[PDB]
Short mmCIF file of N, CA, C and O in Angstrom, two decimals:
data_model
loop_
_atom_site.label_atom_id
_atom_site.label_comp_id
_atom_site.label_asym_id
_atom_site.label_seq_id
_atom_site.Cartn_x
_atom_site.Cartn_y
_atom_site.Cartn_z
N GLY A 51 0.82 -1.26 0.00
CA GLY A 51 0.00 0.00 0.00
C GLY A 51 0.83 1.27 0.00
O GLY A 51 2.06 1.22 0.06
N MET A 52 0.17 2.43 -0.12
CA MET A 52 0.89 3.71 -0.05
C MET A 52 1.59 3.86 1.29
O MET A 52 0.96 3.77 2.34
N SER A 53 2.89 4.14 1.26
CA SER A 53 3.62 4.36 2.50
C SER A 53 2.95 5.44 3.33
O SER A 53 2.55 6.49 2.82
N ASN A 54 2.83 5.19 4.63
CA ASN A 54 2.28 6.18 5.54
C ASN A 54 3.16 7.41 5.61
O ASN A 54 2.72 8.45 6.10
N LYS A 55 4.39 7.31 5.14
CA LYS A 55 5.28 8.45 5.14
C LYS A 55 4.77 9.57 4.23
O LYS A 55 5.12 10.73 4.46
N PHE A 56 3.96 9.24 3.21
CA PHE A 56 3.34 10.29 2.40
C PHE A 56 2.32 11.12 3.17
O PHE A 56 2.01 12.23 2.74
N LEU A 57 1.75 10.58 4.24
CA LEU A 57 0.64 11.25 4.92
C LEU A 57 1.13 12.48 5.66
O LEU A 57 2.25 12.49 6.18
N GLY A 58 0.35 13.56 5.64
CA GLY A 58 0.72 14.76 6.37
C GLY A 58 0.59 16.00 5.52
O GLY A 58 -0.08 16.01 4.47
N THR A 59 1.21 17.08 6.00
CA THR A 59 1.12 18.40 5.38
C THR A 59 2.48 18.76 4.82
O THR A 59 3.50 18.61 5.49
N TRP A 60 2.48 19.17 3.57
CA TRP A 60 3.70 19.38 2.82
C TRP A 60 3.74 20.83 2.34
O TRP A 60 2.76 21.31 1.76
N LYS A 61 4.87 21.49 2.55
CA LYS A 61 5.05 22.88 2.17
C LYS A 61 5.99 22.96 0.99
O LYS A 61 7.10 22.38 1.01
N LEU A 62 5.57 23.68 -0.04
CA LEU A 62 6.41 23.83 -1.21
C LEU A 62 7.68 24.57 -0.83
O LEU A 62 7.63 25.60 -0.15
N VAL A 63 8.82 24.05 -1.26
CA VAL A 63 10.08 24.72 -0.94
C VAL A 63 10.89 24.97 -2.20
O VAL A 63 11.92 25.64 -2.17
N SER A 64 10.43 24.45 -3.34
CA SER A 64 11.24 24.54 -4.54
C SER A 64 10.40 24.18 -5.77
O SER A 64 9.62 23.23 -5.73
N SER A 65 10.55 24.95 -6.85
CA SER A 65 9.78 24.70 -8.07
C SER A 65 10.58 25.12 -9.29
O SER A 65 11.05 26.26 -9.37
N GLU A 66 10.77 24.20 -10.23
CA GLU A 66 11.42 24.50 -11.49
C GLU A 66 10.48 24.15 -12.63
O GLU A 66 9.92 23.05 -12.67
N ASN A 67 10.35 25.09 -13.56
CA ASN A 67 9.66 24.92 -14.83
C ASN A 67 8.16 24.75 -14.69
O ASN A 67 7.52 24.20 -15.59
N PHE A 68 7.57 25.23 -13.60
CA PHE A 68 6.11 25.13 -13.47
C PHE A 68 5.41 25.96 -14.53
O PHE A 68 4.43 25.51 -15.13
N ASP A 69 5.92 27.16 -14.84
CA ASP A 69 5.28 27.96 -15.86
C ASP A 69 5.24 27.26 -17.22
O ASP A 69 4.19 27.21 -17.86
N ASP A 70 6.37 26.70 -17.67
CA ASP A 70 6.33 25.96 -18.93
C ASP A 70 5.37 24.78 -18.85
O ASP A 70 4.68 24.47 -19.83
N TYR A 71 5.31 24.10 -17.70
CA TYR A 71 4.38 22.98 -17.57
C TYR A 71 2.94 23.46 -17.76
O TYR A 71 2.20 22.92 -18.59
N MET A 72 2.54 24.51 -17.04
CA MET A 72 1.19 25.05 -17.20
C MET A 72 0.94 25.44 -18.65
O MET A 72 -0.10 25.10 -19.22
N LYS A 73 1.93 26.07 -19.29
CA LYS A 73 1.75 26.47 -20.67
C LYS A 73 1.55 25.25 -21.56
O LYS A 73 0.65 25.23 -22.41
N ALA A 74 2.32 24.18 -21.33
CA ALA A 74 2.12 22.95 -22.11
C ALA A 74 0.74 22.35 -21.88
O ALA A 74 0.20 21.70 -22.77
N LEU A 75 0.16 22.55 -20.71
CA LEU A 75 -1.19 22.07 -20.44
C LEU A 75 -2.26 22.93 -21.07
O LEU A 75 -3.45 22.58 -20.99
N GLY A 76 -1.90 24.09 -21.60
CA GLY A 76 -2.90 24.96 -22.18
C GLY A 76 -3.46 25.98 -21.22
O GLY A 76 -4.50 26.60 -21.52
N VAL A 77 -2.80 26.21 -20.09
CA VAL A 77 -3.27 27.18 -19.12
C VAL A 77 -3.11 28.59 -19.67
O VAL A 77 -2.07 28.95 -20.23
N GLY A 78 -4.15 29.40 -19.48
CA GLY A 78 -4.17 30.78 -19.94
C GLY A 78 -3.26 31.68 -19.13
O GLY A 78 -2.72 31.33 -18.08
N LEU A 79 -3.13 32.90 -19.65
CA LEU A 79 -2.24 33.92 -19.11
C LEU A 79 -2.52 34.24 -17.64
O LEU A 79 -1.59 34.47 -16.86
N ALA A 80 -3.80 34.39 -17.28
CA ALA A 80 -4.16 34.85 -15.95
C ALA A 80 -3.97 33.75 -14.92
O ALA A 80 -3.46 33.99 -13.81
N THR A 81 -4.35 32.54 -15.27
CA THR A 81 -4.15 31.43 -14.35
C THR A 81 -2.66 31.11 -14.19
O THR A 81 -2.23 30.72 -13.09
N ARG A 82 -1.86 31.23 -15.25
CA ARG A 82 -0.41 31.08 -15.10
C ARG A 82 0.14 32.11 -14.13
O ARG A 82 0.89 31.77 -13.20
N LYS A 83 -0.26 33.36 -14.30
CA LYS A 83 0.23 34.41 -13.42
C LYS A 83 -0.10 34.08 -11.97
O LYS A 83 0.78 34.08 -11.12
N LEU A 84 -1.34 33.69 -11.69
CA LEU A 84 -1.71 33.33 -10.33
C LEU A 84 -1.05 32.03 -9.88
O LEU A 84 -0.73 31.87 -8.70
N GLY A 85 -0.84 31.09 -10.80
CA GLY A 85 -0.25 29.82 -10.41
C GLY A 85 1.21 29.94 -10.01
O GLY A 85 1.68 29.22 -9.12
N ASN A 86 1.96 30.82 -10.69
CA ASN A 86 3.38 30.98 -10.44
C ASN A 86 3.65 31.71 -9.14
O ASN A 86 4.76 31.61 -8.61
N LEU A 87 2.65 32.41 -8.62
CA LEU A 87 2.71 33.05 -7.31
C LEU A 87 2.18 32.19 -6.18
O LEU A 87 2.51 32.47 -5.01
N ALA A 88 1.39 31.16 -6.49
CA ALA A 88 0.48 30.54 -5.51
C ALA A 88 1.21 29.89 -4.32
O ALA A 88 0.70 29.93 -3.18
N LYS A 89 2.36 29.26 -4.56
CA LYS A 89 3.11 28.53 -3.53
C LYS A 89 2.19 27.76 -2.57
O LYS A 89 1.97 28.14 -1.41
N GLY A 90 1.66 26.65 -3.05
CA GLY A 90 0.65 25.91 -2.31
C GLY A 90 1.21 24.92 -1.29
O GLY A 90 2.38 24.53 -1.29
N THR A 91 0.33 24.54 -0.38
CA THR A 91 0.53 23.47 0.57
C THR A 91 -0.24 22.24 0.11
O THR A 91 -1.36 22.36 -0.38
N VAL A 92 0.35 21.05 0.23
CA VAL A 92 -0.30 19.81 -0.18
C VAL A 92 -0.51 18.94 1.06
O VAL A 92 0.44 18.67 1.80
N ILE A 93 -1.75 18.53 1.29
CA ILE A 93 -2.12 17.69 2.43
C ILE A 93 -2.61 16.35 1.91
O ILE A 93 -3.65 16.27 1.24
N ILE A 94 -1.90 15.29 2.28
CA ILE A 94 -2.25 13.93 1.89
C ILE A 94 -2.80 13.22 3.11
O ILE A 94 -2.13 13.14 4.14
N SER A 95 -4.00 12.67 2.96
CA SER A 95 -4.67 11.99 4.05
C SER A 95 -5.31 10.73 3.49
O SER A 95 -5.42 10.56 2.28
N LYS A 96 -5.73 9.84 4.37
CA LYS A 96 -6.44 8.63 3.98
C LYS A 96 -7.51 8.29 5.00
O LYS A 96 -7.29 8.45 6.20
N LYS A 97 -8.64 7.82 4.50
CA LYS A 97 -9.71 7.23 5.32
C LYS A 97 -9.97 5.86 4.70
O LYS A 97 -10.62 5.76 3.65
N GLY A 98 -9.51 4.81 5.37
CA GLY A 98 -9.61 3.48 4.80
C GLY A 98 -8.76 3.33 3.55
O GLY A 98 -7.55 3.53 3.61
N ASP A 99 -9.37 2.93 2.44
CA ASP A 99 -8.64 2.81 1.18
C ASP A 99 -8.86 4.01 0.26
O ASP A 99 -8.55 3.94 -0.93
N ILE A 100 -9.43 5.10 0.77
CA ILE A 100 -9.61 6.34 0.00
C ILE A 100 -8.55 7.32 0.44
O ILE A 100 -8.50 7.73 1.61
N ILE A 101 -7.71 7.71 -0.51
CA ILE A 101 -6.63 8.66 -0.30
C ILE A 101 -7.13 10.01 -0.78
O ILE A 101 -7.81 10.10 -1.81
N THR A 102 -6.84 11.06 -0.02
CA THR A 102 -7.21 12.40 -0.41
C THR A 102 -5.95 13.22 -0.52
O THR A 102 -5.08 13.15 0.35
N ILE A 103 -5.85 13.97 -1.62
CA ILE A 103 -4.76 14.89 -1.86
C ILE A 103 -5.39 16.27 -1.99
O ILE A 103 -6.19 16.51 -2.91
N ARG A 104 -5.08 17.14 -1.05
CA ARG A 104 -5.65 18.48 -1.01
C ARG A 104 -4.54 19.50 -1.24
O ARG A 104 -3.50 19.43 -0.60
N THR A 105 -4.77 20.44 -2.18
CA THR A 105 -3.80 21.49 -2.49
C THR A 105 -4.43 22.82 -2.11
O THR A 105 -5.49 23.17 -2.63
N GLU A 106 -3.78 23.56 -1.21
CA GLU A 106 -4.32 24.81 -0.69
C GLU A 106 -3.46 25.99 -1.11
O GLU A 106 -2.24 25.96 -0.96
N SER A 107 -4.10 27.05 -1.60
CA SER A 107 -3.39 28.29 -1.88
C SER A 107 -4.33 29.46 -1.67
O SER A 107 -5.55 29.31 -1.55
N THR A 108 -3.74 30.65 -1.60
CA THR A 108 -4.54 31.86 -1.45
C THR A 108 -5.43 32.05 -2.67
O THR A 108 -6.56 32.52 -2.54
N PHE A 109 -4.94 31.64 -3.84
CA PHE A 109 -5.75 31.68 -5.06
C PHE A 109 -6.87 30.64 -5.03
O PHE A 109 -8.06 30.99 -5.11
N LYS A 110 -6.54 29.36 -4.88
CA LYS A 110 -7.53 28.31 -5.10
C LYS A 110 -7.18 27.11 -4.23
O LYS A 110 -6.00 26.82 -4.05
N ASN A 111 -8.19 26.47 -3.65
CA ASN A 111 -8.04 25.20 -2.95
C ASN A 111 -8.73 24.12 -3.79
O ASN A 111 -9.82 24.34 -4.32
N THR A 112 -8.07 23.00 -4.00
CA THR A 112 -8.70 21.89 -4.68
C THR A 112 -8.38 20.61 -3.93
O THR A 112 -7.50 20.58 -3.08
N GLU A 113 -9.14 19.56 -4.23
CA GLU A 113 -8.75 18.26 -3.67
C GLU A 113 -9.32 17.14 -4.53
O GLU A 113 -10.36 17.28 -5.17
N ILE A 114 -8.63 16.01 -4.48
CA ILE A 114 -9.09 14.79 -5.13
C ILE A 114 -9.10 13.69 -4.07
O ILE A 114 -8.23 13.66 -3.19
N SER A 115 -10.07 12.80 -4.17
CA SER A 115 -10.12 11.59 -3.36
C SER A 115 -10.25 10.40 -4.31
O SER A 115 -11.02 10.46 -5.27
N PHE A 116 -9.53 9.32 -4.02
CA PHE A 116 -9.44 8.22 -4.97
C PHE A 116 -9.00 6.94 -4.27
O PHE A 116 -8.44 6.94 -3.17
N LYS A 117 -9.25 5.84 -4.97
CA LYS A 117 -8.71 4.54 -4.60
C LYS A 117 -7.65 4.13 -5.63
O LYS A 117 -7.79 4.39 -6.82
N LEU A 118 -6.59 3.50 -5.17
CA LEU A 118 -5.49 3.19 -6.07
C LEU A 118 -6.01 2.35 -7.22
O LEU A 118 -6.81 1.42 -7.03
N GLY A 119 -5.57 2.70 -8.42
CA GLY A 119 -5.91 1.96 -9.63
C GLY A 119 -7.35 2.06 -10.09
O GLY A 119 -7.71 1.37 -11.02
N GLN A 120 -8.17 2.91 -9.50
CA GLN A 120 -9.55 3.05 -9.96
C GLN A 120 -9.73 4.45 -10.56
O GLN A 120 -9.60 5.46 -9.86
N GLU A 121 -10.05 4.49 -11.84
CA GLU A 121 -10.18 5.74 -12.57
C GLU A 121 -11.30 6.60 -11.99
O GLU A 121 -12.33 6.10 -11.53
N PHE A 122 -11.08 7.91 -11.98
CA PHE A 122 -12.06 8.83 -11.42
C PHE A 122 -12.05 10.10 -12.25
O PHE A 122 -11.08 10.43 -12.93
N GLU A 123 -13.16 10.81 -12.17
CA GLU A 123 -13.32 12.08 -12.87
C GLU A 123 -12.74 13.20 -12.01
O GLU A 123 -12.97 13.25 -10.80
N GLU A 124 -12.03 14.11 -12.66
CA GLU A 124 -11.37 15.20 -11.96
C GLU A 124 -11.63 16.47 -12.75
O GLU A 124 -11.56 16.46 -13.98
N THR A 125 -11.95 17.56 -12.05
CA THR A 125 -11.93 18.88 -12.66
C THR A 125 -10.75 19.58 -12.02
O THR A 125 -10.75 19.82 -10.80
N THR A 126 -9.71 19.81 -12.82
CA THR A 126 -8.45 20.30 -12.30
C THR A 126 -8.55 21.78 -11.96
O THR A 126 -9.51 22.46 -12.31
N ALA A 127 -7.51 22.28 -11.28
CA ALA A 127 -7.51 23.70 -10.91
C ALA A 127 -7.60 24.60 -12.12
O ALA A 127 -8.21 25.69 -12.04
N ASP A 128 -7.03 24.18 -13.25
CA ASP A 128 -7.08 24.94 -14.49
C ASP A 128 -8.27 24.55 -15.36
O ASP A 128 -8.31 24.93 -16.54
N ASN A 129 -9.26 23.86 -14.79
CA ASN A 129 -10.55 23.55 -15.46
C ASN A 129 -10.44 22.55 -16.59
O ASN A 129 -11.21 22.60 -17.55
N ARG A 130 -9.50 21.63 -16.52
CA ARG A 130 -9.55 20.49 -17.38
C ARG A 130 -10.47 19.44 -16.76
O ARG A 130 -10.41 19.18 -15.55
N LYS A 131 -11.29 18.82 -17.61
CA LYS A 131 -12.17 17.74 -17.20
C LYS A 131 -11.46 16.46 -17.61
O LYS A 131 -11.42 16.12 -18.80
N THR A 132 -10.83 15.80 -16.65
CA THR A 132 -9.96 14.69 -16.96
C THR A 132 -10.49 13.39 -16.36
O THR A 132 -11.29 13.36 -15.41
N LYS A 133 -9.96 12.31 -16.92
CA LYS A 133 -10.06 10.97 -16.36
C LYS A 133 -8.69 10.67 -15.76
O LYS A 133 -7.68 10.71 -16.47
N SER A 134 -8.66 10.38 -14.47
CA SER A 134 -7.41 10.28 -13.74
C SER A 134 -7.31 8.93 -13.04
O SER A 134 -8.33 8.33 -12.68
N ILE A 135 -6.07 8.48 -12.85
CA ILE A 135 -5.81 7.24 -12.12
C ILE A 135 -4.54 7.44 -11.33
O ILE A 135 -3.57 8.02 -11.84
N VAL A 136 -4.52 6.95 -10.09
CA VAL A 136 -3.33 7.01 -9.25
C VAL A 136 -2.91 5.57 -8.96
O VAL A 136 -3.76 4.75 -8.59
N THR A 137 -1.64 5.28 -9.20
CA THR A 137 -1.07 3.95 -9.05
C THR A 137 0.18 4.04 -8.20
O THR A 137 0.70 5.13 -7.92
N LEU A 138 0.65 2.87 -7.77
CA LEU A 138 1.81 2.75 -6.91
C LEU A 138 2.82 1.90 -7.65
O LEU A 138 2.50 0.77 -8.07
N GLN A 139 4.00 2.45 -7.86
CA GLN A 139 5.05 1.79 -8.63
C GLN A 139 6.37 2.05 -7.92
O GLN A 139 6.83 3.20 -7.86
N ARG A 140 6.98 0.98 -7.39
CA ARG A 140 8.25 1.10 -6.67
C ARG A 140 8.22 2.22 -5.63
O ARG A 140 9.17 3.00 -5.50
N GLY A 141 7.16 2.28 -4.84
CA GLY A 141 7.08 3.31 -3.82
C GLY A 141 6.75 4.72 -4.30
O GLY A 141 6.62 5.62 -3.46
N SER A 142 6.67 4.94 -5.59
CA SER A 142 6.27 6.23 -6.14
C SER A 142 4.77 6.24 -6.33
O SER A 142 4.16 5.25 -6.76
N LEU A 143 4.16 7.36 -6.00
CA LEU A 143 2.72 7.52 -6.11
C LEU A 143 2.47 8.28 -7.41
O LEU A 143 2.83 9.45 -7.53
N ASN A 144 1.89 7.60 -8.40
CA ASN A 144 1.91 8.06 -9.79
C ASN A 144 0.50 8.36 -10.28
O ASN A 144 -0.35 7.47 -10.31
N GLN A 145 0.29 9.59 -10.70
CA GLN A 145 -1.00 10.05 -11.18
C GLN A 145 -0.94 10.33 -12.68
O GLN A 145 -0.01 10.99 -13.15
N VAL A 146 -1.91 9.82 -13.43
CA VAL A 146 -2.08 10.18 -14.84
C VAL A 146 -3.43 10.86 -15.00
O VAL A 146 -4.42 10.45 -14.39
N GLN A 147 -3.46 11.94 -15.80
CA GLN A 147 -4.69 12.61 -16.18
C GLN A 147 -4.81 12.57 -17.68
O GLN A 147 -3.85 12.91 -18.38
N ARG A 148 -5.99 12.19 -18.17
CA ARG A 148 -6.28 12.10 -19.59
C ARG A 148 -7.48 12.96 -19.95
O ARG A 148 -8.51 12.96 -19.25
N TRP A 149 -7.34 13.68 -21.06
CA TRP A 149 -8.40 14.56 -21.57
C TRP A 149 -8.11 14.92 -23.01
O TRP A 149 -6.97 15.18 -23.39
N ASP A 150 -9.16 14.94 -23.82
CA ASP A 150 -9.04 15.36 -25.22
C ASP A 150 -7.88 14.67 -25.92
O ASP A 150 -7.14 15.29 -26.68
N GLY A 151 -7.70 13.38 -25.65
CA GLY A 151 -6.60 12.62 -26.22
C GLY A 151 -5.22 13.02 -25.76
O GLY A 151 -4.23 12.59 -26.35
N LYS A 152 -5.11 13.87 -24.75
CA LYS A 152 -3.85 14.26 -24.17
C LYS A 152 -3.68 13.57 -22.82
O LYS A 152 -4.64 13.01 -22.25
N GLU A 153 -2.45 13.61 -22.33
CA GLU A 153 -2.12 12.94 -21.08
C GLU A 153 -1.00 13.70 -20.42
O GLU A 153 -0.06 14.11 -21.09
N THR A 154 -1.10 13.82 -19.10
CA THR A 154 -0.02 14.34 -18.27
C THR A 154 0.14 13.43 -17.05
O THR A 154 -0.80 12.73 -16.65
N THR A 155 1.35 13.38 -16.52
CA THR A 155 1.63 12.54 -15.36
C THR A 155 2.23 13.39 -14.26
O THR A 155 3.00 14.30 -14.53
N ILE A 156 1.86 13.07 -13.02
CA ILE A 156 2.40 13.70 -11.82
C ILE A 156 2.90 12.56 -10.95
O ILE A 156 2.10 11.77 -10.44
N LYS A 157 4.21 12.48 -10.76
CA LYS A 157 4.82 11.40 -10.00
C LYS A 157 5.38 11.97 -8.72
O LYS A 157 6.08 12.99 -8.75
N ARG A 158 5.05 11.34 -7.61
CA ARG A 158 5.38 11.82 -6.28
C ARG A 158 6.17 10.74 -5.57
O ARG A 158 5.66 9.63 -5.39
N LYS A 159 7.40 11.06 -5.19
CA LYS A 159 8.29 10.12 -4.51
C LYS A 159 8.86 10.81 -3.28
O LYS A 159 8.77 12.03 -3.14
N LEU A 160 9.27 10.00 -2.30
CA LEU A 160 9.95 10.48 -1.10
C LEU A 160 11.46 10.34 -1.28
O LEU A 160 11.95 9.28 -1.68
N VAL A 161 12.19 11.42 -1.00
CA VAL A 161 13.63 11.49 -1.20
C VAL A 161 14.22 12.18 0.02
O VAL A 161 14.16 13.41 0.13
N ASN A 162 14.86 11.40 0.89
CA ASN A 162 15.49 11.91 2.10
C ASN A 162 14.56 12.87 2.84
O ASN A 162 14.96 13.97 3.22
N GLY A 163 13.32 12.42 3.06
CA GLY A 163 12.36 13.15 3.85
C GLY A 163 11.50 14.14 3.08
O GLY A 163 10.45 14.54 3.59
N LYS A 164 11.91 14.53 1.88
CA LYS A 164 11.17 15.48 1.05
C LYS A 164 10.23 14.73 0.11
O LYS A 164 10.50 13.59 -0.27
N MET A 165 9.13 15.39 -0.29
CA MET A 165 8.30 14.84 -1.36
C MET A 165 8.64 15.58 -2.64
O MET A 165 8.59 16.82 -2.69
N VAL A 166 9.02 14.82 -3.66
CA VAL A 166 9.42 15.35 -4.95
C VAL A 166 8.33 15.00 -5.95
O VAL A 166 8.11 13.82 -6.24
N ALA A 167 7.72 16.03 -6.54
CA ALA A 167 6.68 15.85 -7.55
C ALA A 167 7.28 16.18 -8.91
O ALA A 167 7.76 17.30 -9.13
N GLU A 168 7.30 15.19 -9.79
CA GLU A 168 7.72 15.40 -11.14
C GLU A 168 6.51 15.35 -12.07
O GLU A 168 5.79 14.36 -12.13
N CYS A 169 6.30 16.44 -12.79
CA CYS A 169 5.12 16.58 -13.65
C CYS A 169 5.57 16.69 -15.09
O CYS A 169 6.39 17.55 -15.43
N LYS A 170 5.01 15.86 -15.96
CA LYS A 170 5.43 15.84 -17.36
C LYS A 170 4.26 16.05 -18.30
O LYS A 170 3.23 15.41 -18.14
N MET A 171 4.43 16.93 -19.27
CA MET A 171 3.47 17.12 -20.35
C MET A 171 4.27 17.35 -21.62
O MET A 171 5.05 18.31 -21.69
N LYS A 172 4.08 16.47 -22.60
CA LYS A 172 4.87 16.44 -23.83
C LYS A 172 6.32 16.28 -23.41
O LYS A 172 6.64 15.30 -22.71
N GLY A 173 7.22 17.19 -23.77
CA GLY A 173 8.60 17.10 -23.35
C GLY A 173 8.93 18.08 -22.25
O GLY A 173 10.10 18.38 -22.01
N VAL A 174 7.92 18.61 -21.56
CA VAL A 174 8.17 19.57 -20.51
C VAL A 174 8.11 18.86 -19.17
O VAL A 174 7.14 18.16 -18.89
N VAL A 175 9.08 19.13 -18.30
CA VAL A 175 9.20 18.46 -17.00
C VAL A 175 9.28 19.52 -15.92
O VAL A 175 10.20 20.34 -15.92
N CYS A 176 8.30 19.52 -15.01
CA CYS A 176 8.32 20.36 -13.83
C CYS A 176 8.66 19.54 -12.60
O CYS A 176 8.16 18.43 -12.43
N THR A 177 9.55 20.07 -11.78
CA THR A 177 9.92 19.46 -10.51
C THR A 177 9.57 20.40 -9.38
O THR A 177 10.05 21.54 -9.33
N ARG A 178 8.77 19.91 -8.45
CA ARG A 178 8.40 20.65 -7.26
C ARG A 178 8.80 19.81 -6.06
O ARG A 178 8.52 18.61 -6.01
N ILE A 179 9.45 20.44 -5.10
CA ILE A 179 9.94 19.77 -3.90
C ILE A 179 9.22 20.33 -2.69
O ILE A 179 9.04 21.55 -2.57
N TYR A 180 8.77 19.43 -1.84
CA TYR A 180 8.03 19.76 -0.64
C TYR A 180 8.75 19.23 0.59
O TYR A 180 9.42 18.19 0.54
N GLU A 181 8.63 19.97 1.68
CA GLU A 181 9.10 19.56 2.99
C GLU A 181 7.89 19.26 3.86
O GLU A 181 6.84 19.90 3.72
N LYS A 182 8.04 18.27 4.73
CA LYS A 182 6.99 17.95 5.68
C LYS A 182 7.06 18.91 6.85
O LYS A 182 8.14 19.21 7.37
N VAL A 183 5.89 19.39 7.27
CA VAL A 183 5.80 20.38 8.33
C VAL A 183 4.82 19.96 9.41
O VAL A 183 4.13 18.97 9.29
#
């Protein structure tokens, strides 16, 4: 199952190439501007076999709840209506979102106490690093 080490509140401490990632996703000018300032907190929790990932910012709060390997509908912060699945692969918590024949992945791994989120769309790679607080 998902390591309990993922559970808790995570503070963004580092972000590379998030703007290009949003642009590759088709995010508009205004949401990019707000997104690059947002510096969100991510809260991962579980109730039974339902995992919840909540992202909080002064701009926008969103959350998803899911069971591993079971596809679910998601309306993303940037208003994509996606089909999403979260899987577990070698201890990495891996999310895929599909919409309009496109796909993006968000991979979350633990690295010396930090949570590292690698987000890929086409050939664009965003890395966001979080510390547990």
